[PDB]
């Protein structure tokens, strides 16, 4: 028998979402210097 071999899967969609959020909130951090 060989049913004791188990393979696992990966889900980092939450992490990638958190990065997309970070990038979007860095867009709000630019400097419009009033000349």
């Amino acid at each position: 028998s060989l049913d004791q071999i188990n393979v696992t899967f990966l889900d980092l969609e939450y992490e990638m979402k958190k990065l997309e959020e970070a990038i979007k909130k860095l867009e709000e951090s630019y400097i419009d210097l009033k000349e």
Binding site: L2, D3, I5, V7, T8, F9, L10, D11, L12, E15, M16, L19, E20, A22, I23, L26, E27, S29, Y30, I31, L33
Partner: protein
């Protein structure tokens, strides 16, 4: 003069900051892209491994039962 120096410094600060922020965003986009790729390849090869184990058990069950019925039929 002093006002001129302060103005010039602020211009530099803003430009350099905004430049760095642009690069940081690109690098975070790149990082999430790589994570996406890594995930896709890892899960693909995980699937290939599960499927290999499936077809392995099917063939092990098909071949290791033929030998037992031969153990019975070589005694007859």
């Amino acid at each position: 003069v002093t006002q001129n120096v302060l103005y010039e410094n602020q211009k530099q600060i803003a430009n350099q900051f905004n430049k760095a922020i642009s690069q940081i965003q690109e690098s975070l986009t790149t990082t999430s892209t790589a994570l996406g790729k890594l995930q896709d390849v890892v899960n693909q090869n995980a699937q290939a491994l599960n499927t290999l184990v499936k077809q392995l058990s099917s063939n092990f069950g098909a071949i290791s039962s033929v030998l037992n019925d031969i153990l019975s039929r070589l005694d007859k």
